[PDB]
Amino acid sequence: GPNTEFALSLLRKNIMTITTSKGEFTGLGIHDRVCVIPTHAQPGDDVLVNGQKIRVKDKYKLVDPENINLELTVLTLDRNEKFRDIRGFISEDLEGVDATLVVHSNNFTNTILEVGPVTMAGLINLSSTPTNRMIRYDYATKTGQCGGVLCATGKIFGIHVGGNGRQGFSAQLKKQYFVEKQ
Structure with missing residues (x-):
């Protein structure tokens, strides 16, 4: 929509x-x-x-x-x-909101896939690799959308760094990381 x-x-x-x-x-x-x-x-x-x-x-x-x-x-x-500063359009409010995975690669030319409600994983390990501040949505994704813009209307949640199986792993792009001077 x-x-x-x-x-x-x-x-x-x-x-x-x-x-x-x-x-x-x-x-x-x-x-x-x-x-x-x-x-x-x-x-x-x-x-x-x-x-x-x-x-x-x-x-x-x-x-x-x-x-x-x-x-x-x-x-x-x-x-x-x-x-354009889409930083004020960053949604660091994640969990419970429906998010859409928008991937635009050479292969995936603007594939807008609605994934459903995203949830917060936090710090979890993936095969001994410790990952911190991951946003996770339970959706069987066909892995390969690295860099996929996880967004909704005026809401950037983050980007799909590497999801696999029913766990779509996206990194939490919180405004804190984009604060120029702290």
Whole structure:
């Protein structure tokens, strides 16, 4: 419904295809030149944005200080035009809300899949790999939507970093991480 139309509007606005080592996935712009992408996707210091060589200004491999994986990487890409601050559209209120997984990769060209109500996992381990601040939705997903923009109408919950089976794992993109100066 309105979530789908928002996704298309967010698409043209802050979403672009990033060619990482894992493949060409979805990159969500947060504000200015600040974008976000998963870690195991392996983004370089210079990367291809829509196939175009571009260099990364600032690269924040964002995990918990204690080596606990958030599987998230925030990067300031060197692009002239700025992304619209969808930071005030971040929904750090997650659990109980219906979320839609919007993935725009080279393969998945804007696949808007409504997944249902998202819940908070918190800190869980995945095969001995400790992950902290994961948002989890119980939905049998066909894994491969790395970078999938988990959103709803005016609500960015985070991005699907790597879900598998009935556990769609998304990272919690809370505004705290995008606070420029604290």
